[PDB]
Amino acid sequence: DAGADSLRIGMGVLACGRPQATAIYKVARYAASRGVPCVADGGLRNVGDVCKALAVGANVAMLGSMIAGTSETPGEYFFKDGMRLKG
Amino acid sequence: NTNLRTKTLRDGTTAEELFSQDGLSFNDFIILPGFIDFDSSKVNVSGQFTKNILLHLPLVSSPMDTVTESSMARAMALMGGIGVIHNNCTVEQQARMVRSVKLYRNGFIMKPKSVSPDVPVSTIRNIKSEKGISGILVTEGGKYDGKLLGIVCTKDIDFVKDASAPVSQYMTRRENMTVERYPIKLEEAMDVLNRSRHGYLPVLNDKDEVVCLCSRRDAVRARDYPNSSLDRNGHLLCAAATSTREADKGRVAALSEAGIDVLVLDSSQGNTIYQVSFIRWVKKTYPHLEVVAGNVVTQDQAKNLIDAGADSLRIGMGVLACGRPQATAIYKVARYAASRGVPCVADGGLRNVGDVCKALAVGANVAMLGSMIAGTSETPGEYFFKDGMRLKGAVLDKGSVLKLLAYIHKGLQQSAQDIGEVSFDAIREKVYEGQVLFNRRSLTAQS
Amino acid sequence: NTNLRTKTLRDGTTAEELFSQDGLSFNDFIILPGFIDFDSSKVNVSGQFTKNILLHLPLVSSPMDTVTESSMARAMALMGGIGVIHNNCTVEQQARMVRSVKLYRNGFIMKPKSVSPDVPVSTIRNIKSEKGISGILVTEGGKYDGKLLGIVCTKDIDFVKDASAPVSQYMTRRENMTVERYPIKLEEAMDVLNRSRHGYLPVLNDKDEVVCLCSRRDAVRARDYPNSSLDRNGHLLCAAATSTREADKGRVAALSEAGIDVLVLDSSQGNTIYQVSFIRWVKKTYPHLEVVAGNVVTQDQAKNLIDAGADSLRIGMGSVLACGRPQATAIYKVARYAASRGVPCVADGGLRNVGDVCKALAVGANVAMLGSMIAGTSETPGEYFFKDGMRLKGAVLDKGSVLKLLAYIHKGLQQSAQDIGEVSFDAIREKVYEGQVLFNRRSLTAQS
Amino acid sequence: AVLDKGSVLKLLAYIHKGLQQSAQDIGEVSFDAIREKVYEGQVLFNRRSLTAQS
Amino acid sequence: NTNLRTKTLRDGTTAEELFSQDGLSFNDFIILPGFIDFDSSKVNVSGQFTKNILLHLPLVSSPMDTVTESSMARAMALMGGIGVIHNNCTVEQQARMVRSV
Numbered sequence A: 001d002a003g004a005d006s007l008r009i010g011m012g013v014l015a016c017g018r019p020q021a022t023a024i025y026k027v028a029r030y031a032a033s034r035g036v037p038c039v040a041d042g043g044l045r046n047v048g049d050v051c052k053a054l055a056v057g058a059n060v061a062m063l064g065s066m067i068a069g070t071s072e073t074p075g076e077y078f079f080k081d082g083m084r085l086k087g
Numbered sequence B: 001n002t003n004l005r006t007k008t009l010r011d012g013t014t015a016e017e018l019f020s021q022d023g024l025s026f027n028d029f030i031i032l033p034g035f036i037d038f039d040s041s042k043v044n045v046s047g048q049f050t051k052n053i054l055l056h057l058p059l060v061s062s063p064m065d066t067v068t069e070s071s072m073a074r075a076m077a078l079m080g081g082i083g084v085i086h087n088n089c090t091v092e093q094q095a096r097m098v099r100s101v102k103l104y105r106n107g108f109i110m111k112p113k114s115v116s117p118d119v120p121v122s123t124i125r126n127i128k129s130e131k132g133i134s135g136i137l138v139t140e141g142g143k144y145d146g147k148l149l150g151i152v153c154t155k156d157i158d159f160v161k162d163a164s165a166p167v168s169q170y171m172t173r174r175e176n177m178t179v180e181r182y183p184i185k186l187e188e189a190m191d192v193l194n195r196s197r198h199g200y201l202p203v204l205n206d207k208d209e210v211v212c213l214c215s216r217r218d219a220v221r222a223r224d225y226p227n228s229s230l231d232r233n234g235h236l237l238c239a240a241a242t243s244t245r246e247a248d249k250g251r252v253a254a255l256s257e258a259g260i261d262v263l264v265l266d267s268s269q270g271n272t273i274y275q276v277s278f279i280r281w282v283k284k285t286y287p288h289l290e291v292v293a294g295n296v297v298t299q300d301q302a303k304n305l306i307d308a309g310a311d312s313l314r315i316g317m318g319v320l321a322c323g324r325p326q327a328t329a330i331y332k333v334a335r336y337a338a339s340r341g342v343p344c345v346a347d348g349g350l351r352n353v354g355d356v357c358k359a360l361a362v363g364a365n366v367a368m369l370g371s372m373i374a375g376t377s378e379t380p381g382e383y384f385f386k387d388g389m390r391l392k393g394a395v396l397d398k399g400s401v402l403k404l405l406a407y408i409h410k411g412l413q414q415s416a417q418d419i420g421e422v423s424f425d426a427i428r429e430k431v432y433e434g435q436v437l438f439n440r441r442s443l444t445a446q447s
Numbered sequence C: 001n002t003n004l005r006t007k008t009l010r011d012g013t014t015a016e017e018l019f020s021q022d023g024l025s026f027n028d029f030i031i032l033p034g035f036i037d038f039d040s041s042k043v044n045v046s047g048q049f050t051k052n053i054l055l056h057l058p059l060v061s062s063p064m065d066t067v068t069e070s071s072m073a074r075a076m077a078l079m080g081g082i083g084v085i086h087n088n089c090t091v092e093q094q095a096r097m098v099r100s101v102k103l104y105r106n107g108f109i110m111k112p113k114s115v116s117p118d119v120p121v122s123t124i125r126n127i128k129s130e131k132g133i134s135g136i137l138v139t140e141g142g143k144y145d146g147k148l149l150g151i152v153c154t155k156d157i158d159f160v161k162d163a164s165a166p167v168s169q170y171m172t173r174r175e176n177m178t179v180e181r182y183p184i185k186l187e188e189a190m191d192v193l194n195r196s197r198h199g200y201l202p203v204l205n206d207k208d209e210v211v212c213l214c215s216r217r218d219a220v221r222a223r224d225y226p227n228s229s230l231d232r233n234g235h236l237l238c239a240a241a242t243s244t245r246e247a248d249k250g251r252v253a254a255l256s257e258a259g260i261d262v263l264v265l266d267s268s269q270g271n272t273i274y275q276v277s278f279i280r281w282v283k284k285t286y287p288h289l290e291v292v293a294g295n296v297v298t299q300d301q302a303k304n305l306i307d308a309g310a311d312s313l314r315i316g317m318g319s320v321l322a323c324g325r326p327q328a329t330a331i332y333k334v335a336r337y338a339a340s341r342g343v344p345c346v347a348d349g350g351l352r353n354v355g356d357v358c359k360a361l362a363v364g365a366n367v368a369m370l371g372s373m374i375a376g377t378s379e380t381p382g383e384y385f386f387k388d389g390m391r392l393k394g395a396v397l398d399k400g401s402v403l404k405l406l407a408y409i410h411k412g413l414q415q416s417a418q419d420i421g422e423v424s425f426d427a428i429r430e431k432v433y434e435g436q437v438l439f440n441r442r443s444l445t446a447q448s
Numbered sequence D: 001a002v003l004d005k006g007s008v009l010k011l012l013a014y015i016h017k018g019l020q021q022s023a024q025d026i027g028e029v030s031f032d033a034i035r036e037k038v039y040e041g042q043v044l045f046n047r048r049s050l051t052a053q054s
Numbered sequence E: 001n002t003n004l005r006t007k008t009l010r011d012g013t014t015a016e017e018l019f020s021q022d023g024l025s026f027n028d029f030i031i032l033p034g035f036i037d038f039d040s041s042k043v044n045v046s047g048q049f050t051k052n053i054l055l056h057l058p059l060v061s062s063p064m065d066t067v068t069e070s071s072m073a074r075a076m077a078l079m080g081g082i083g084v085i086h087n088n089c090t091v092e093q094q095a096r097m098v099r100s101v
């Protein structure tokens, strides 16, 4: 109603939230009925999760942990225990 | 902002639906968010401990011998909660602990600790170390209503090497004391005390005998703890536990003399003929006393105990084959009791702020803290070092219970903000109305 | 009881034999018992931090930014130890922390905190909350040596609702104050303070200007902390760390002005030309200053740094990097050499329980440096937080007050010395070198 | 299979810097000098008890 | 700074003594520190791969088929080391990799 062009879906200080697949389905269905797409934000840890999130109503998926540690992220690389981690 | 806050779509599950299938623990469900138009500091978390006692902080220290004694009860009441002194002790010890809580904070101190002029300084030092009170009055014959001869404070004895000397040698003597004459209003007396820059102000009759005493420490405590739970006379509220045996009647009497404001019945299964008779007897004999009955987990038990005259119910059970999952128990018992005008106390399984928030939201008015506050400085027992850890006797040190209570307070406020209501009374009402909604969580969703 | 205490059979292993083989850790050996004819309360645990500073409690707080700042150094000095203010900070911050330690305890307070009459009460409350000092003097122009107008204490403002009011409204005015005139002996002034039942006693000149100030809190601190580490003027001892770069010279100057009693050099490998030159320069420029050099783990390093003029050595390296040494061996070897040259040593690293501290002191260290063992105590820097139902600090678990922990370590050291059969740790070290305090190496299996 | 360690060039540089730092702590400006002084008894070692290896 | 660097006390164990007993792994011993009068950037780490080849970087890539082929050998040589092309391959492939390097 305020005029949003898209919605970020995801929550889960500890006693308030919602399981993410249900949240995506419900919010995406309502928003789509009103012509608004949705972004799945949270709990996407592999390609199967992303596929499911898109299939049940999300138009696009937000990548956090899944892309953390790639070369293009902020931070400097360092060697520790022969592993090449990033901070 | 009613149009924005009121849910019409109502995308979620009401409490009545959530608790209608199988017994639930707190991890089985989550609370859905609502609408926010306020900052979390504005949230009211108070709940009714009993029909007539409202607690600014909906927190109660459990009556276990490892958790609540005078010090813990003092801390709870000071922060706006209350403590229940355990009954794993003699009647005399329990009454003394209650008296210690009740007489810690005062307006006019009616029986000021007093000594005779010939008492050694060592005795006053012992008083300060054990009971923690300064400004000891020295009077004729040591009676608290005797003629006032002098007063002993910190700086009068902090330098004397001979602890056997009489207090008369170092006390501030009557002829040099700022005093007031009976009768006097408390406001004026405390203003005079403040203007005098001294720590104490005796109030005497025309015979110079001690009527009562005003302490600057009381004003400072009022300043530092503005939300303390207080009775009509300015003492901290205090509760005590008891079994429902015939012997315990004597215990109750003693506690009533010590000035408890709430009696808490101690039973794993409180739906007994003994507890019903006990409640009837207490309400008959000590009408000023409010009774928290329990423990119960079902509405049938609650009905019997409320019929008996209970002013509140303790919820929780779970020798091994009988009990009930605590979230369901709280919801069911709290709903019935509320329909009959009786508040409820969640007793068990509260291990973090989220659990406490959920327990309060689904119907509990206040929450009882056991394990969560075990190991704080104010619990009974001595500290000891082992493996570089500082445990207490078998729990880890949690610091002051005051900081922990403030932490819990802020967490409850933040939870209420996320839910979208500015008080937990409003949260409970909207839960019953279906405007605060939930989601059951699959076992996998709980990771 | 010399016939009973002196060992003739000598059933055991001397330190020299024990350390003549592979490098040892503290768990590799145990100390054999001797003869007891005294109660543990009578045991003296003191050790030399440096050539000239004896510590009643042979404990030093490590100069890590997570361990030692003003509060920790104060606590250590009060209990008879000492703290080393870390150098992960600017010169100004480090100097301020040093000043906070040095000016906490005094006899005559020479630069009493003072304000002008028109200052708001809010300022006095802020002073008390931040720096923790009451008894603020109100003087002409706010000068600490200005004409004395009054004093503000806790009970003078604890009831005022308008925090913007001037202190002159509520101060105790000079005409009603007990004071003393310069000159006066500290004993007499403090007796006057005790008799007066007040918290403070200014000392003024003939013009009523402020010369200095006596605080009853200092007397109470002296009574409650009789073993505090004190310098000649009654201030707490304080130490500070610094690197050996040329820049750090400025730092040292600042620290010297702040009143440090001991400078502590900060290096993983202190046997360097830079550190030798730095020690030479400090001993030339600030002769009143004592220097703790290091870190070292071998006698050759120790020789170079003692030749340069070090007053004490920090022992430890390794307590990846292929260079270091097992800490018990390092302590024994370096301490033996340094003692032969009259220099005491500090055990720095791998001290994780009271038994380890006792062994480190027994095999030659004069004092012990505490890091991890005291991390998480209330007096360390950092903020507390609740997480997973745990009171962590930012992380480490809360260990409560360091004062109680220091007392616990003290009692443990006393009890260990009793079982060993000697009434002081100086005696233990001497008898170790003499072969009258004996050890046993422990097989790996015997360590369970 | 093995985990990705990135470019070997950066790893070689890391090893180079570590070797330099170790040589510095040992107190010699070349590894030829270290080997010679090892044979000469001027670079010294300590055997480590099994307990000292923790 | 010879007086400062040369050890006369010699508080430590020589390599000869250290290795005169049971067979040792690298974790069985540590190297004691000496004397420092230089910055780490000035340290020469070179070593002889062979009688006539000095390597600025004393590192050689092992000739395992999972480690060293043309690209790895190139990288090693560029940084001052060297690589050894594995022989789990035909003569023609190995020669081609060598040519690529």
Ligand SMILES: Nc1ncnc2c1ncn2[C@@H]1O[C@H](COP(=O)(O)OP(=O)(O)OP(=O)(O)O)[C@@H](O)[C@H]1O
Pocket (backbone or CB within 6 Å): B133, B134, B135, B151, B152, B153, B154, B155, B156, B171, B172, B176, B177, B178, B179, B198, B199, B200, B201, B202, B216, C197
């Ligand atoms: N009403 C009074 N009139 C005059 N003098 C008083 C009065 N009350 C206390 N005193 C004296 O004034 C001085 C107060 O010193 P002190 O600092 O110990 O007071 P306090 O801090 O308020 O009490 P305490 O610290 O023991 O709780 C003492 O000598 C005390 O005997």
Ligand SMILES: Nc1ncnc2c1ncn2[C@@H]1O[C@H](COP(=O)(O)OP(=O)(O)OP(=O)(O)O)[C@@H](O)[C@H]1O
Pocket (backbone or CB within 6 Å): B197, C134, C135, C151, C152, C153, C154, C155, C156, C171, C172, C176, C177, C178, C179, C196, C198, C199, C200, C201, C202
């Ligand atoms: N030497 C003095 N002469 C006269 N009045 C004094 C003197 N020292 C303090 N006072 C006043 O006596 C009263 C002391 O009250 P207060 O309890 O706050 O001081 P304190 O207990 O000694 O130290 P604190 O500031 O830490 O409380 C104040 O009114 C103070 O101005």
Ligand SMILES: Nc1nc2c(ncn2[C@@H]2O[C@H](COP(=O)(O)OP(=O)(O)O)[C@@H](O)[C@H]2O)c(=O)[nH]1
Pocket (backbone or CB within 6 Å): B096, B103, B104, B109, B110, B111, B112, B113, B114, B131, B133, B134, B135, B136, B137, B213, B215, B217
């Ligand atoms: N002089 C003085 N008395 C106080 C103060 N605060 C509370 N009291 C009173 O001190 C009394 C202590 O009771 P007490 O005789 O010691 O009970 P007991 O522990 O059973 O011996 C109580 O009656 C309190 O009312 C204070 O600040 N100063």
Ligand SMILES: Nc1nc2c(ncn2[C@@H]2O[C@H](COP(=O)(O)OP(=O)(O)O)[C@@H](O)[C@H]2O)c(=O)[nH]1
Pocket (backbone or CB within 6 Å): C096, C103, C104, C106, C109, C110, C111, C112, C113, C114, C131, C133, C134, C135, C136, C137, C213, C215
């Ligand atoms: N009025 C008062 N001054 C004190 C007391 N204790 C110490 N002082 C002195 O108060 C001074 C504090 O100096 P300060 O202004 O905090 O240092 P700054 O950081 O440079 O401003 C020091 O000179 C202390 O010696 C006390 O109890 N009362």
